[PDB]
Amino acid sequence: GSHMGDITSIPELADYIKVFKPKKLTLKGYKQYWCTFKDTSISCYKSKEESSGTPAHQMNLRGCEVTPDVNISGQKFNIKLLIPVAEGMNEIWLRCDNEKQYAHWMAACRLASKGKTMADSSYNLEVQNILSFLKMQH
Ligand SMILES: O=P(O)(O)O[C@H]1[C@H](O)[C@@H](OP(=O)(O)O)[C@@H](OP(=O)(O)O)[C@@H](OP(=O)(O)O)[C@H]1O
């Protein structure tokens, strides 16, 4: 809602990365979408136009399971996004794009696990940790 508390989305976190799923039926996978962490639920827009700008997916997924495995040797970042649900498990994995990428979602994703987003000072240590390897060697 929007009356006494929960005025707006206190925790703002958003970025654009690639996503690709095996799809249960067929679909097409491979899509550029910019999701954002609102008050306590997520939102998804593939085109601010959508004729009305209304997002296609909007719900509180949370429980995102993150697996950190990024070898800087070839500057290869590989984070798999898994989420348990009633149907079973939504296997999802986003593609890499630049160190600035892992810092935004890899951290938020982790936080998003405890339910909150990068609104915790702890996340600082998560992003401050990755960029630390760059200082050591590109
Ligand atoms: O537009 P089409 O070709 O139908 O495909 C989309 C994409 O698969 C979306 O992927 P992403 O999750 O990266 O946004 C999402 O898949 P999922 O269904 O697995 O969530 C949409 O869910 P639906 O719009 O609810 O069908 C699906 O419709």
Swiss-Prot record:
Superkingdom in the source lineage: Eukaryota
UniProt: a 1,2-diacyl-sn-glycero-3-phospho-(1D-myo-inositol-3,4,5-trisphosphate) binding residues: K21
Induction: By serum in lung fetal fibroblast cultured cells.
Tissues where this protein is expressed: Ubiquitous. Found in numerous tumor tissues.
Effect recorded for K21A: Reduces phosphatidylinositol phosphate binding. Reduces integrin activation
Residues of the PH domain: 18-114
Compartment list: Cytoplasm; Cytoplasm, Cell cortex; Cytoplasm, Cytoskeleton; Cytoplasm, Cytoskeleton, Stress fiber
Cited function: Scaffolding protein that enhances integrin activation mediated by TLN1 and/or TLN2, but activates integrins only weakly by itself. Binds to membranes enriched in phosphoinositides. Enhances integrin-mediated cell adhesion onto the extracellular matrix and cell spreading; this requires both its ability to interact with integrins and with phospholipid membranes. Required for the assembly of focal adhesions. Participates in the connection between extracellular matrix adhesion sites and the actin cytoskeleton and also in the orchestration of actin assembly and cell shape modulation.
Domains: entry comment: The FERM domain is not correctly detected by PROSITE or Pfam techniques because it contains the insertion of a PH domain.
Assembly information from the UniProt record: Interacts with ILK. Interacts with FBLIM1. Interacts with ITGB1 and ITGB3. Interacts with active, unphosphorylated CTNNB1. Identified in a complex with CTNNB1 and TCF7L2/TCF4. Interacts with ITGB1; the interaction is inhibited in presence of ITGB1BP1.
Family indicated by similarity: Belongs to the kindlin family.
Protein name (record): Fermitin family homolog 2
